[PDB]
């Protein structure tokens, strides 16, 4: 067997991704979304109650599909992402990044020895289908994909040290913890967080990187798809399923 | 402790109880479904991957909100209703019901002896708090609902007869299998079937019945209503969770 | 590896062995019902919540310990049957036993062909150790033990004629489901439903059968004791955890 | 998206195809065995410790693979049969089948109404992908696939009147359990069981039906290859796990 | 709907709340423990074998139930009490708090920002129940109550600098860990441990926070209640479980 | 009941002790490499996906065979540590220690205060078996053994200071992780590496300290037993089913 492709990896430079949030945190609901179509998927480990076994029965749901599996950590904490990377998420988003030494720390944790720290666990891990791929310690750090999220007033404070980060493919903007870091909680629609987020995504693009965001609301996604941002997630299947129920029970009170 | 008022069996003689198919198997999606606010949640034994554990746990979540627990088992297996109603499901939807001998013996199954064959266990179940409601055995039977499925050509063949029987609460229509018995797989919206159900409602609640059917159709949903079917289920959850993914991802394609 | 000799089994015939009803449906649990030294732990797949899958954790918890392992199925189900000895159960208490018939095909479910029904995959069971125990399919029989409960009318009618089956190993007497079928539902402890159950024991006992029971009732289960009962279970894991918890609450109310 | 093509069930015309039992029970255990590259693998709910959500998460694990994937029920229950179909489970291995009207009951689980008894809930399916197959309830029943086990004495009673059932696909023989049927528990070796066998194979093919068998023994599944047997299991997870790890020891002892 | 009252915080300044300490680590053993009427409950994530996962089974348990949710998390870990507050817990026990610095780290990980740095997932959580609490941004901070664990001599040794942090609702003392640190393991009862609990409990109401312990002992228990201790939990669900089995089947040897 | 022996670690001073790495990271597959005869078995919570819960699930699997449970953190962590010995792990394997301090600091994790940092919770423990051993917090300390890694050139940069760290019992080298940090990843067998193991193994030996390894290469095993390693790890579950599952389909292809 050769090491998966990770697609979403190479599309950062050739196409705009589409992504659905999946914090379900269930296999048989992940893979409910990815039937759907969608480019990426994010499998929540920071805000849906998921573990490593849970993101495991995830992207084993999912690896049948397209969709291209993300996964967010709780945290960029060094040990997990060597747990995430070895049951085989090639595709990280790191919540909270706020500093190019953060950043620098963030890709060796995705890299092998000698020039990363990712411990070597070959012959238990599924990212090597358990050594299946006959040469996954010599190809595995090609198709991995670093993403990191700038959503604290000191991420936006590092923010060009962060873009010098060689390892960076992608920033991600959230705007949930970015509009509360700017005193707007739950208010990110604002013309003040809005016009940072629109610099933030052009200074991105600018040093080179893909450029990611998160919005439910239709005409924002649009806007952010219009200025070229790479990866953007349209909705999450929580509020869908909220939305959908709640939606139909109005037309019968 | 009192036993748990089955408030849905209630008002299946005072109102028109708008219900939500659980389908997606899981404690944490049934929560979601419970907090929108549907008068009934059928969780799905029958046609979800569900087992008496994992339906106990989906029973936990919804205990906290209004929405009255309804539990569907594969089929009208006497054990198995024993072991739902131990977990403490208070009303029971009897798939493929086909004879007055068969509906007389779903009925025996919800009641303890000597009246009933109810395998008694107090002291172990969930149904009476582990004897913390400490006259569960002598008002168990009060607060169980019996309904039972008409949904194949033997059964519209013994309606009258399965009208008959005391201890049926209600009889629900399965459109899906009462159309494929009928020839017309997957098109329940014909014609031909719709008089047959039309008038099978009109015999259901001309015989003192409440009357129950599932039409995820608005238009149809809303004629039954205006017939007075008691209880109609308006929706599915896997349905609502992909629909609404699919219409999100095509305003982006 | 040699089979695991059944000590239940054999010491139906030298002592009184005193049992624990395990409705907590769970392996850590159990494990701690095994560090108490009860004779036997009945794991009950009827009145709980338990499923193979359940039963098997709870096995592997209690196996560590000299505690004994019976097993209760949901009914006699002759495929259930089948499953509960390949996880490796080795005592199978059987509810609500009504005929010689039923107690022959129990008999059966129980032992290999040719003489039996049991299904044979030694390679695939826990039974076997997975043919680790390398002589299974011909050592398995003599250490597997049936157990059949009398608790109806029925029961009591045929009690004469189950007693007269070969491989029938004991008869236990369930008081709930037995004062539930004499009319005297919640209230097993009336002197009608006792003179019925002690004349049970004395015809158990004299037919060379090991009688059994279950009484949370102290001086009731010493006064069983007194009669000879070799298999006496005196109290239900759910019963003492809530008695245990509300008991401390009154001192502080 | 167009149903899922059932190739094993194609394959039984056009070539021998081999196979590896899946009693490990678990959805990472399954995955391991789903990269070998085996044609079939049989996930045993007869032998292993199997319920309906298991075999979902293994059906899940298997699918991003290209082996096809068989399910064993623990018997022919029709309600379990639809509970495995509506999970996805295309092929069915039912075990003990020794009767032409089992055999054509078996057929009818298969098949939706009129022409047969199937459930119908394509809403709630993995088998639909929850309607995402759009046609699903007019193009499923040509992707499924129904094999039959003869293993006892009356299976080979009436082998001519199973093979005459038109939609038994293919007969698996049980050596296990057919040679614990003929008086040779544990010893299918012996030559009149294999001459049993060689006869019940070319009877099978004689009718136009697919012949099925497993053998850890290489020189027997090798002659039965030789004979045409159409699908052909050669091993067993459980069984290589545990053997390949006694072999590693001795060599330390 | 409008947020969760937490009455448990309200209730620290208007009476004593009696509380059971729950390590049976199932949402099933939980669920008996909220049926008994203790005040408050905690769920222990740091003695217990709790994650995220098994944390939300009981906090869904316990919601049908008055009893209030605390959760004890493994320690002080930022992230770690992100994901339990988003779950739902609304009281967050912490245990081995040694400075002001970490008890004002502790505050702020229970605030959004900009005041706090709390991750907002609002979208995803149940503690929004999904955003069906339309102003969960804007009311979750005044029903998270933060209590804090005294039990080290770093921690006596910083008392009066943690009982000056706004924020801190209320410091436990935790007899077992503190007996450790001063050199009396397991014998908590001692005159010398027993001393400082009295005086450090008099010390946190001379600052205005509520006091908290746990005892076993029903003396000690008393007498903390009697010098005005708001919260006490006064058993432990396996100590009573394993003790009430125990003195069972003393009865019978 | 008395404390459980830790034989492992007596045996570190009287035999070399032959190791299977259990990386299949379910309570099932762990039950059957404990009936292999291993003298010890590696419970792998770094490279498998194991969490607390699902560790202890396979220690109670194992705890009814002789082989001796080692459990690795996925990290030093010091709460993690905490929660593993409070299920009864009583053999620790720290991975990538680099220091003298880390080392002294993973001593104390491991021991009760006043000495050492480990929480006190015995009433919660399966370690203590909930109390049911009277004087664990006397004797836990004695039956825990400490194992550390060195497979950095940071660890070989601080191998004599590691060696002089009172509390160490043993230092286990990691070749996939140590080639990879010396420039030779997926290359453990090159005579650059191969020297540096066998100098380090001497230096470990010469120190009071047991030495271990893990090698799936026989020759390289037998050379590392030669040469005194205490504890050698000779195979990988999941690589052995892996590797037998396809030498088995090579005979057929
Ligand atoms: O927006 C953020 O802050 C995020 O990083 C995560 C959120 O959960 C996501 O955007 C959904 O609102
Ligand atoms: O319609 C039926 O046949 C049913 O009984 C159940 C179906 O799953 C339900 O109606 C959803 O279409
Ligand atoms: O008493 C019976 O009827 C039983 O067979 C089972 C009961 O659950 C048991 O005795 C506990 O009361
Ligand atoms: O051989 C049989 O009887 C079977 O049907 C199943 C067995 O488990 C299988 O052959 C493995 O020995
Ligand atoms: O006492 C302590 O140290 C605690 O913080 C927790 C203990 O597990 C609890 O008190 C039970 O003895
Ligand atoms: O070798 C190492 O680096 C280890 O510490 C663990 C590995 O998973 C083990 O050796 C199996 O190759
Ligand atoms: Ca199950
Ligand atoms: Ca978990
Ligand atoms: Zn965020
Ligand atoms: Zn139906
Ligand atoms: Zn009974
Ligand atoms: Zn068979
Ligand atoms: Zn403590
Ligand atoms: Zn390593």
Same mark, same amino acid.
């Given at each position: 067997?050769?090491?998966? =492709? ?15 949030? =999946?914090?379900?945190? %269930? ?5 409910? +979304?990815?039937? =759907?179509?969608? %480019? ?11 573990? !490593?076994?849970?993101?495991? +029965? ?12 993300? &996964?967010?950590?709780?945290?960029? %904490? &060094? ?12 595709? *990280? ?7 190019? @030494? ?12 000698? @020039? $990363?720290?990712?411990? &070597?666990?070959?012959? *238990? ?16 750090? @090609?198709?991995?994909?670093?993403? &990191?999220? !700038? ?13 010098? !980060?060689? $390892? ?24 003040? !967080? ?17 450029? $990611?965001?998160?919005?439910?609301? @239709?005409? *924002? +996604? ?9 990866? =953007? ?21």
């Amino acid at each position: 067997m050769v090491n998966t =492709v990770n697609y979403f990896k190479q599309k950062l430079k050739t196409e705009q991704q589409i992504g659905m949030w =999946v914090g379900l945190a %269930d296999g048989y609901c992940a893979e409910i +979304a990815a039937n =759907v179509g969608y %480019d990426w998927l994010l499998i929540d480990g920071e805000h849906a109650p998921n573990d !490593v076994r849970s993101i495991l +029965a995830q992207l084993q749901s999912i690896a049948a599909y397209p969709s291209q599996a993300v &996964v967010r950590p709780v945290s960029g %904490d &060094v040990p997990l992402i060597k747990q995430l990377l070895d049951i085989g998420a090639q595709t *990280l988003l790191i919540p909270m990044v706020e500093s190019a @030494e953060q950043a620098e720390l963030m890709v060796k944790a995705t890299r092998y020895p000698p @020039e $990363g720290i990712r411990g &070597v666990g070959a012959a *238990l891990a599924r990212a090597s289908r358990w050594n299946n791929i006959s040469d996954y310690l010599q190809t595995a750090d @090609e198709q991995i994909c670093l993403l &990191v999220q !700038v959503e604290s007033k000191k991420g936006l404070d590092n923010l060009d040290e962060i873009l010098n !980060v060689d $390892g960076v493919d992608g920033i991600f903007i959230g705007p949930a913890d970015l509009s509360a870091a700017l005193g707007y909680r739950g208010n990110p629609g604002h013309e003040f !967080v809005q016009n940072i987020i629109v610099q933030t995504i052009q200074k991105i693009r600018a040093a080179g990187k893909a450029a $990611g965001i998160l919005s439910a609301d @239709e005409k *924002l +996604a649009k806007q952010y798809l219009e200025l070229g941002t790479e990866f =953007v997630a349209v909705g999450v299947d929580t509020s869908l399923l909220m939305k959908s129920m709640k939606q139909l029970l109005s037309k019968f009170k």
